[PDB]
């Protein structure tokens, strides 16, 4: 049983130290079910993926399996993948197309909006006389139906109906979000196939990485990684390194963004030569400019950001994923690529071709990442190092590092105060009970 | 045939290959195997053609009415979609001794049986299905195993081993990867 | 740390709706082990696994593995297969004939009655001048004893010398268990052969849907089970369906069972015309009905029963089961089939491969059955899956579905009356500590 | 020899038979492995004789006395027992899209080898003993491991496979079934 | 090459070996396999010549500047270190009923493949590579899985099965033995 | 919640009574971890393991990961295998020789000390002007450093700084150990290989084995394995038993060992011939004698012993292992093989062959140790197998079996006086919460 102020005690901002307890511990991980997985706004994917009436995609919300589909009013509604009947899986498929869905136990159907319109023997079993007439009623047997909201192609859900609305929830994190998604007018696509594959580490690891960690790709994370981009008569002794650079903490949420500034070597080792030209000269670089002028956009390289708690993305090589946890222990990638809409059909082969090679299950920057993450939760299964005081104090009283060219809260691009700013938010969303004090 | 659908059964020739031909394509195979087991990426990259393509669809999981969907189609999404270059960053890597995914490396053993050969129009060139069992273990405990089937153009070369990979389809038993990474080759 | 008052509430019966927790709560699981498994009588296979003196069948009482054991007597006798010094399974073998049982750690051997018989160097090492001078005695170390009955071939054990007899027990359910195991004065025989296999499921699913669910046949779990019969000329459009028929729930128990009417159609589909016959027509069906004189059983077809809480058969199909649970996410089946001593031999034969191709492991029927199973435990994994309220409101409150002609109480044979029983029940044995108030 | 006990070991030939044969043989395992992981049911169901015995027996444990009890013997229960009729409505269920635990179908891959070929009296009449991994794995993390000994009798025919099934014995390395179901061919 | 190290690929001859030596190494190692996975331990035992030497050494885990520390070498402690003698006498153990790790026995299957041959300066002598799977079964649920190599010395001999096995070097794809223990024959 | 009065009644020594649920109980195996494993001297390896400057060997503590490396003055030191970032694994090998430790994650790098020596960007990144000036210090963030003590080559470690030094730990056992330890002014030597592999069960069978349990190996699990080593013309008839002989059990600690007198038969078919001429007779037997002469080693054959709670070994046959715990049902043995240095090269070579024909994952003796246990633990899932009152009664209230030419309490050979003794200083190190009383 664990109160609010043992919970508080986890996680210090103030000076930087974190209980390593939140990475393993089973009951912490049930009162994350309830109190952030139960009540945050999650990525389920994108408009591309359901762009026709009765489309419908099958995704999860923490270890929930939940339908998202597209409904006749060209509107998202998501339910959660269970008959209510005896709990039967009522969509097995991945995704498609449907005009119902249909449960194989006992034949139970449902609209594409989630209502039960079919009851087999419903009038020799069910009812007297008339439907309803003996307590049974179709609309009392639905599947729950989740809150859902878009934000610029991404489709976002929330069980909580006390929770704030999508674009209060995101803070001032969405300049920092639309430097991917509001560079046309068009919008963005999702290239076809989400790519799924299973981690066993926490979901808090791979979340902050995203959040304020750039800090691994700027030391030895990833020199294997950068090498494999580099010409035949290029090694590592002869590229620099980069240390220009800041990041972003939300005033509420926990979302964090961090990325380098006039200098395109980080992602140039990732994308090539024809993306970061893409991504920084001619009319659609521009047109990016007057779509985002709370930023300097054309002057941020290789950005990581993490909207709380699990949506994460990569602005330039635009890797995007959804960490689904499956206990303490282990999580779920469910990553896709984003292409703007009216990008150039090389451009699109190249974002296609180029993640595949760097920020994939197999990718050469990707797989030195799991590694480190899956070790670290092999030794939390030790007495000693599951208790352990870990060390947040980075950029920690650290005067002079903000940027007044950014909106919100600034640090240095090697810093972890978007990472602290995660951890306080997860601290109070496990800590408050009500969203009269938690909201923003 | 090379546009066979993965879905469907590989398109074998009216009478099997000679015995000759069929030795030979497996102890290519065999040799191919050793070399990836015993973690001898130079030499095994060097049975890359220079116009290689190796790829590896991503496999969903898709009820009756919708089964041509269940592979998501070239130039889309994959978990592997390479070029010679590409490979050859991949082998950069792997020989960098800063590959953490696989340093400590993976301790790995590529069963190749189920090899049925098929003769092309092109002199010297060959469509090969197999059937394959990749058991990967590494560090303590962590053991991933990997089945299914890989489709490869072969053609004869000048080297000692006889043969180079022209293309390499993978077909992956699996829709969700189990394993944390794909830092293996197959 | 689950209230009386709490686990009540897990069931209503009265307004038909059940607490999706029931099925995957690990200390609601542990509770069962005590409350249900512990103090249940539970069918461990019949009289013809052990018909000679010594021989004996490893099985399992809950999660405690047991050895039942024919004694000198003829009586039967069940004990724990555990030895009473350092917990090692002393009898390794599936079944087969003995004159002692051995433990090979430090060799010390019982007799087939239980009996510690043989402690190796106990002159040298336990005692001084005599045989438990020095305060140890070998009829203090015997593995812990079942009470043992047997009902019309079938044998039971129950831990608790508290609980009701076998007879009581069964409450008013006897004569629908004799249309399958009274039906000659020969008994029956237990072809050899028990399959065993693994189930990712809880075991109320499987017991329910012996106790209750016909709906799941009627419908559309076996269309595909159904057409496998059929020959080449015939397909699922030319066949009926079945609509006739009733369902019985025992007045104390929790026992189930249901069965269609005047209709053969669903029993000629999984056994056949050959059994078909020799279930209605001839002296071996004339017998049968004198038998059992209480149900009209030559009107009846293609019946399922449960025993509480885990004894599960199909009368005319004459597949037997008991589900050993495995946790709150697994199950393991232990299925045999039943044929009368006295059947043809080619009737015998024909109840054997017509099971085999049906009821089975890799049957035609039994394959669709646990895959709905399965992925209902998979969805039970999600946080607010796993607190649905799930319907069980199916022929509540619904007038005039009863039937005369059958002992106890009756409902519609698509209903859910026998299965309100099985959770009620279930959750009066959860939840009152004592026989004084649970006993009928 | 036919009814050679199944925990006995294959009665090969004096000396083994020719490469041409072994060839064969072992192509068309890999053909009809083919069918089944590609789920060409209708295919493979032609590859049966008209009088097929399909028959996989339930293996037990014993101890060392009554080790002759490992096996549950003909005209008992088994885990299948078939005709070309039962195995019709096996194929009639599989090819129904009713067929609930194969839909969506699983993955499957059926690895051949340890081919050990005997001719029989009848002239192209054979018994053929070899080893199988059948990996299975299906919807999103399910995944089931068969390993064990087929003995079969095959027949020449006038197919383009050019063989017939005309009897299969099903050795799974495994007492108690460790999956949900055997819901794949053998 | 006897003394290549183990991390290293097999020394294969310039060119494979005949199609009939394949077939008789193959087809030898398929009827070893047979023996083992149906307990004929006296049979399988008899194999073995007067100076085998059978041998299987741990392998460690190390990054890339300690790579050549990866095998304990020999005559340091193993797994397997025998000779004709110490093997005959697990022989007794297996067949006495006594041995309570195989009493009941484990289900076995010897999965044989790339077997790749090299013809020794030794008339009737030969050195052998190949893959293998090890599927090991017992009791109600214990399932442990084994893949690696084996690197086999044979001799021509006037036995049945026309080979005996000189020397038997496995290497198994694990640093930690993640069964109980290694109660069944590589 | 357990209670120290309920941990105490768990264990009876008095009445030779043992609770079932020590081996299995999860809540019981968390407090091991705390109150045992986190406070009780545990051994690593040997010294010989890491000889040079630099050298290191990667183990375990129970379940946490730890560095055992040598140091510059020759001193070894212990800290945890846990950076104290992020929790990354600091060393990835098994050993070998460094001359620092540095984390692939964010490349922190610590010494051979255990300090953090080196941060990227520290000057940049973590201070203003001057390094610790913003509140971070190096000096702060070194993982967990564990107490280390030697005893005669084997290294033993220790995280509490209030339990007793080694030696003090060790009671009155140290005698026993030096049978195999202290034979000759040259040490011993660890062969090189250390044998790892997975038993799933409680490490308190192979640690109670090992400390009072001759018993198993003087009736029948090791009758196959003694026929391993018996000549064609010789069987299991042939050879005697052996009946003489005695065991010891700690003043305090639980430690235990057990030993046949005046009969090198046991020996003789473990080690064979040859060394058993080297453990008798000769100018080495004559100087052990004289090095250990508060034991008559010359008389004692196939010792067994376990220092508490899981390093264990056998004196004659020089095999030595820990138990890592893995959970209440697993294990992980770690065992190697030690000689005396100053040993004849054909004498080593003996001791290297016959420890991997016997005491090895694949030994004839071993296997059929690990069988026994295995099903022991899968028994105990039952509700009613884990609950079992266990016999421990064996030699308990026995007169007149103890022997004066033996230093502390000792028994009969066949007896659990050790083991009663092994069990109730658990039950204190689990019930008392300081040293205050625990220690000696
Ligand atoms: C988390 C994930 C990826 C990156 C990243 C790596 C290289 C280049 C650009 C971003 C930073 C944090
Ligand atoms: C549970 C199990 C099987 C059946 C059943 C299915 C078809 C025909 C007869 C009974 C009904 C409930
Ligand atoms: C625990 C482990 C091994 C032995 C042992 C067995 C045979 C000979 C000598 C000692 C006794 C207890
Ligand atoms: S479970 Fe969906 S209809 Fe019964
Ligand atoms: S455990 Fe059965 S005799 Fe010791
Ligand atoms: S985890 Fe070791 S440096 Fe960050
Ligand atoms: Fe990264
Ligand atoms: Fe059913
Ligand atoms: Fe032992």
Same mark, same amino acid.
């Given at each position: ?440 | ?109 590529? !069963?190749?049986?189920? &090899?049925? @050969? ?7 060139? %060959?469509?090969? $299905?197999?059937?394959? =069992?990749?058991?990967?273990?590494? !560090?303590?405990?962590? &053991?991933? @195993? ?7 153009? %072969?053609?004869? $070369?000048?080297?000692? =081993? ?19 990474? %794909?830092?293996?080759?197959?």
């Amino acid at each position: 049983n664990w109160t609010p102020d043992a919970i508080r005690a986890l996680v210090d901002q103030d000076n930087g130290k974190l209980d390593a307890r939140i990475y393993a511990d089973q009951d912490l991980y049930q009162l994350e079910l309830e109190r952030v997985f139960g009540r945050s706004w999650l990525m389920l994917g994108h408009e591309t993926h359901i762009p026709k009436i009765g489309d419908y995609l099958t995704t999860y919300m923490g270890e929930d399996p939940v339908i998202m589909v597209r409904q006749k009013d060209q509107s998202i509604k998501v339910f959660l993948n269970q008959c209510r009947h005896r709990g039967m899986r009522i969509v097995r498929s991945d995704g498609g197309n449907a005009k119902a869905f249909t449960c194989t136990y006992h034949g139970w159907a449902y609209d594409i909006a989630g209502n039960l319109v079919n009851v087999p023997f419903e009038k020799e079993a069910f009812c007297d006389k008339k439907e309803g007439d003996c307590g049974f009623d179709k609309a009392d047997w639905g599947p729950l139906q989740a809150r859902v909201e878009t934000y610029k192609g991404l489709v976002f859900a929330n069980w909580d109906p006390e929770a704030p609305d999508l674009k209060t929830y995101l803070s001032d994190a969405m300049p920092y979000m639309d430097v991917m998604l509001d560079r046309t007018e068009a919008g963005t696509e999702a290239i076809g196939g989400i790519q799924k594959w299973v981690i066993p580490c926490n979901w808090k690891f791979a979340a902050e990485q995203f959040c304020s960690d750039m800090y691994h790709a700027g030391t030895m994370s990833h020199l294997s990684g950068v090498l494999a981009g580099l010409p035949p008569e290029m090694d590592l002794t002869q590229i620099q390194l980069s240390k220009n650079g800041n990041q972003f903490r939300s005033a509420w949420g926990g979302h964090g963004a961090g990325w380098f500034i006039n200098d395109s070597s980080i992602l140039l080792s990732v994308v090539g030569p024809k993306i970061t030209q893409y991504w920084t000269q001619g009319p659609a670089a521009e047109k990016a400019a007057r779509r985002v002028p709370q930023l300097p956009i054309l002057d941020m390289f290789g950005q990581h950001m993490t909207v709380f708690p699990t949506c994460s993305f990569l602005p330039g090589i635009n890797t995007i994923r959804t960490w689904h946890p499956r206990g303490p222990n282990e999580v779920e990638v469910w990553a896709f690529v984003l292409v703007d809409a009216d990008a150039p059909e090389d451009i699109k082969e190249e974002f296609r071709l180029q993640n595949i090679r760097t920020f994939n299950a197999g990718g050469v920057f990707e797989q030195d990442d799991g590694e480190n993450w899956v070790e670290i939760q092999r030794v939390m299964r030790g007495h000693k190092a599951k208790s352990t005081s870990l060390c947040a104090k980075m950029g920690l009283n650290v005067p002079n590092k903000n940027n007044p060219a950014y909106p919100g809260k600034t640090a240095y691009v090697y810093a972890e105060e978007a990472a602290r700013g995660m951890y306080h938010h997860w601290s109070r969303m496990m800590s408050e009970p009500s969203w009269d004090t938690l909201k923003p | 045939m090379i546009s066979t659908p993965l879905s469907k059964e590989f398109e074998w020739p009216a009478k099997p290959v000679s015995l000759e031909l069929q030795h030979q394509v497996e102890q290519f195979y065999y040799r191919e195997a050793q070399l990836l087991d015993h973690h001898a990426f130079q030499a095994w990259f060097a049975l890359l053609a220079e116009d290689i393509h190796y790829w590896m669809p991503i496999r969903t999981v898709r009820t009756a009415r919708e089964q041509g969907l269940e592979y998501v189609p070239a130039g889309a999404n994959a978990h592997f979609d390479d070029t010679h270059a590409t490979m050859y960053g991949r082998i950069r890597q792997k020989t960098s001794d800063l590959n953490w995914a696989e340093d400590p490396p993976s301790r790995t053993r590529h !069963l190749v049986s189920n &090899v049925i @050969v098929r003769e092309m129009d092109t002199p010297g060139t %060959l469509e090969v $299905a197999s059937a394959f =069992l990749l058991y990967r273990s590494r !560090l303590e405990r962590q &053991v991933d @195993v990997f089945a299914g089937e890989r489709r490869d153009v %072969l053609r004869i $070369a000048d080297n000692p =081993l006889g043969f180079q990979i022209a293309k390499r389809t993978i077909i992956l038993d699996q829709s969700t990867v189990l394993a944390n990474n %794909l830092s293996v080759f197959f």
